[PDB]
RNA sequence: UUAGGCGGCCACAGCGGUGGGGUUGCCUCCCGUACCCAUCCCGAACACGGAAGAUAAGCCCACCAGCGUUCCAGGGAGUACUGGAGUGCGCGAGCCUCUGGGAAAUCCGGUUCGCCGCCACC
RNA sequence: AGUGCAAGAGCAAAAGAUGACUUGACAGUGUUCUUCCCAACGAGGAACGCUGACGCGAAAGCGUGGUCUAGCGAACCAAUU
RNA sequence: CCUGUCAAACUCCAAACUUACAGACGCUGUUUGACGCGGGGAUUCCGGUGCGCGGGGU
């Protein structure tokens, strides 16, 4: 910028998307990273491995393609997050992946958050990932019970486009039920 | 276009730089929310040998808490032209500061992929005066 | 292919230079060797530059020198057409001389000593304190200039 | 002391003042002479005094030669003549003197000198065609007070 | 030398050029080498841990196993064989 | 990649600037605090819930070279410096010839407003 | 800028600041380099492992004192576990 | 803006050159056994000069 002596940060630091200090500690494990990223509307979970010219994604899952299995609900909540994780975890198991380490990027390790939900799903899918149970959300909140009770305080519908009036965390149960099934076209 | 460009109040910080407290009680009642202490750095000859220690207090007001305070705060001041920051901010007086800015300010305040706001989208002294003046008062 | 001829003694000459001359199969003053022009060989003559006399000789001159100073790998045996015929891959000295210049083979390859032990220059050389461009006898030579030396030391 | 003790460049560059203390002040009173407000490009003639050998010139000689040169220019062109001379070199090299025999011989600081390579311009004057012979004379007096032989070269003078 | 510490006269070799300042990329600090692999030794100024004795900068050893995460590289100092414990951060694959 | 995620190299990618782009799509800004979580004070941020609005920010796309940077041509320069040799010159400090290498500043004209890998996706 | 102290070097979502929790400034035993370039030589030192027990963290992980290079001592005898 | 100068303990630059490893050519070793390893015996630890590069000192 200023002169020849000036030091310009690494591109992914410039962009403020990669925390290199945490990335190193992450890579030290030797295991693949379960990259857990969010969006205002969606949730993504990638199984990333190290490569000669950049990272390699062996398996992944976006909350958008969650509807491809019978999801009529939104895509930026707890049930959505957990399910996206389980889906990604299942595709991972299929590719030969057996273990991983949770990479939450620039997100906060808040107790019960979505990235921990994403983690809980991948583990449930059969992946061995170093975790901590009391940092994960209550099984009910994962289901989306916190939102069903919120709609209980109605007077005005929570959801715009009709999915249902009082909402159905049972849909979470139905979908999880669907994924754990041996068949299903991944 | 006009909507995602029209200014708003980011925050209103009321602060009292004492120098050695009992003043927290008045700020609480005048603003509506609980205040926070203010410390200091570097040793001072005006009896400030203790680095980290109470000197003043402040309160950052946002949303309703800010406007409801400003409706009764602005009348007490005699606003001027010079009293304006190049960023479209202003301070007067127990000091009272109003932080003004355009809609998508979160871009520079968030953690992920944060970016500094472009100069073409940053509020101007003129654009600030106007917005403020267009709400129960006079300029200069 | 160039003809190397040591014209300066070993005393006081740097060791890494003296070693190079020995790698180029030359151990005494007035000894000559035939070196191919490759990158590697080029670096070597450059290092020896100041204590040597080199250059590409004419087919004729080479034939003269080979006939007079070449020797077997062992023994006094004269290297003449008849010798060249019964031991080499050639028909006569001229055949050998041609192959050397064209860099198709080596003296060692044909069972000949890698060194042509020449006689002191008749009428003397142009001096071992200056290069060719300065009227001296050290360094690179003209094809005509090198011949004058080799023929003089026949 | 004799210049023979300091004229040659036979020691490392010793200038770092952050490590050397008690360095004597420079006897050189001025570096810009004549009319310093007027530009050099405002003069038709430009004559420089060129040092033929690489040497070290002590500030004492720098001042002495600069003095005897400009003093002549003043005498011949008046105290405010239409000329402007320049001493471009500065005494950066710090000198020592071992003044206990050869034990703890690192000397004490005694002065400063300017290093000048052969062919360099020590002095450079700018005058009008009418005053060129006076400046050539000023330089003739100046080169008598410095160690090397010098050349009085004209860089802008078709007037001959 | 005035002193005989390990960092004696290492002012140059253990300093980064201005633009190479700051934390180094993780990629090369996690690189995996195999036994027999020729590797160049060069201390990365920005990396504190896992360094070898500065006197060995410039060497090209042979990976002969690892101790923990660090590597055991064989070298020949003059005429003496030595084994060096060094992390990937200070190693480059030859060629 | 009609706007995405993770990266490698880590300015050829910086700084500054102009133009263009989003009905159930994307990223955003955005709207909103019952919950999980949060502020030594502020749902600002962090966290969670969500779409009435918007493409003005960001981001993605196209382009500009003024500053900074990378590389290239010519000039400076085979100059400065230099490994090897000399019964070559100089009172001397030092210089020269031969042989093998060979800058830097600066000028001028080009170049550069990132390249590449993996995954996902009208 | 700061990072206890020479000088040189390292460091910015930190190696700095603040806050909080904590005692790994832990026990045992090694590998390697250094001390002593090359090239033999003690004490001392450092880097890097293993075993045990722990602290913190969601976790990867970090902690074998202070970002790195100075702050050190044989045999005999005494006290101590 | 313009103009005048420097650095053993300065560096946006930057050689020649020295140096690690490898391949090639060369030379060398496999009856002259190299490279290396183990053992016996030393002497030696006042050096000097030329050249190049030095640091101190008129
Ligand atoms: Cl994210
Ligand atoms: Cl080491
Ligand atoms: Mg014979
Ligand atoms: Mg005769
Ligand atoms: Mg003669
Ligand atoms: Mg040095
Ligand atoms: Mg626009
Ligand atoms: Mg002479
Ligand atoms: Mg005793
Ligand atoms: Mg005791
Ligand atoms: Na004495
Ligand atoms: Na670095
Ligand atoms: Na406090
Ligand atoms: Na926009
Ligand atoms: Na030891
Ligand atoms: Sr000297
Ligand atoms: Sr003179
Ligand atoms: Sr809000
Ligand atoms: Sr060339
Ligand atoms: Sr440390
Ligand atoms: Sr050297």
Swiss-Prot record, chain B:
GO terms for biological process: translation. Keywords: Ribonucleoprotein, Ribosomal protein, RNA-binding, rRNA-binding, tRNA-binding. Gene3D superfamilies: 3.30.1440.10. The keyword RNA-binding applies. One of its GO terms (molecular function) is tRNA binding. Signal peptide: none annotated. One of its GO terms (cellular component) is ribosome. Pfam families: Ribosomal_L5, Ribosomal_L5_C. This is 1 of 5 proteins that mediates the attachment of the 5S rRNA onto the large ribosomal subunit, stabilizing the orientation of adjacent RNA domains. Forms part of the central protuberance. Modeling places the A and P site tRNAs in close proximity to this protein; the 5S rRNA and some of its associated proteins might help stabilize positioning of ribosome-bound tRNAs. In the 70S ribosome it is thought to contact protein S13 of the 30S subunit (bridge B1b), connecting the 2 subunits; this bridge is implicated in subunit movement. HAMAP family: Ribosomal_uL5_A. Part of the 50S ribosomal subunit. Interacts with protein L18 and the 5S rRNA, and probably with tRNAs. Forms a bridge to the 30S subunit in the 70S ribosome. Belongs to the universal ribosomal protein uL5 family. This is Large ribosomal subunit protein uL5.
Curated annotation (Swiss-Prot), chain C:
Pfam families: Ribosomal_L30 (PF00327). Residues 114-146 are annotated as: Disordered. One of its GO terms (molecular function) is rRNA binding. Keywords: Ribonucleoprotein, Ribosomal protein, RNA-binding, rRNA-binding. Gene3D superfamilies: 1.10.15.30, Ribosomal protein L30, ferredoxin-like fold domain. PROSITE patterns: RIBOSOMAL_L30 (PS00634). Disulfide bonds: none annotated. Residues 123-144 have a biased composition (Basic and acidic residues). The keyword rRNA-binding applies. GO terms for cellular component: cytosolic large ribosomal subunit. One of its GO terms (biological process) is translation. Part of the 50S ribosomal subunit. Binds 5S rRNA. This is Large ribosomal subunit protein uL30. It comes from Haloarcula marismortui (strain ATCC 43049 / DSM 3752 / JCM 8966 / VKM B-1809) (Halobacterium marismortui). The gene is rpl30.
From Swiss-Prot, chain D:
One of its GO terms (cellular component) is ribonucleoprotein complex. The keyword Transcription regulation does not apply. InterPro entries: Ribosomal_uL16 (IPR047873), Ribosomal_uL16_arc (IPR022981), Ribosomal_uL16_CS_euk_arc (IPR018255), Ribosomal_uL16_dom (IPR016180), Ribosomal_uL16_euk_arch (IPR001197), Ribosomal_uL16_sf (IPR036920). Pfam families: Ribosomal_L16. Keywords: Ribonucleoprotein, Ribosomal protein, RNA-binding, rRNA-binding, tRNA-binding. The keyword Glycoprotein does not apply. Disulfide bonds: none annotated. GO terms for biological process: translation. It comes from the Archaea. GO terms for molecular function: rRNA binding; structural constituent of ribosome; tRNA binding. Part of the 50S ribosomal subunit. Weakly binds 5S rRNA. Probably binds the A and P site tRNAs. This is 1 of 5 proteins that mediate the attachment of the 5S rRNA onto the large ribosomal subunit, stabilizing the orientation of adjacent RNA domains. Modeling places the A and P site tRNAs in close proximity to this protein. Belongs to the universal ribosomal protein uL16 family. PANTHER family: 60S RIBOSOMAL PROTEIN L10 (PTHR11726). This is Large ribosomal subunit protein uL16. It comes from Haloarcula marismortui (strain ATCC 43049 / DSM 3752 / JCM 8966 / VKM B-1809) (Halobacterium marismortui).
UniProtKB/Swiss-Prot annotation, chain E:
GO terms for biological process: translation. Keywords: Ribonucleoprotein, Ribosomal protein, RNA-binding, rRNA-binding. PROSITE patterns: RIBOSOMAL_L21E (PS01171). SUPFAM superfamilies: Translation proteins SH3-like domain. GO terms for molecular function: rRNA binding; structural constituent of ribosome. Residues 1-65 are annotated as: Disordered. Gene3D superfamilies: Ribosomal protein L21. GO terms for cellular component: ribonucleoprotein complex; ribosome. This is one of 5 proteins that mediate the attachment of the 5S rRNA onto the large ribosomal subunit, stabilizing the orientation of adjacent RNA domains. Belongs to the eukaryotic ribosomal protein eL21 family. HAMAP family: Ribosomal_eL21. This is Large ribosomal subunit protein eL21. It comes from Haloarcula marismortui (strain ATCC 43049 / DSM 3752 / JCM 8966 / VKM B-1809).
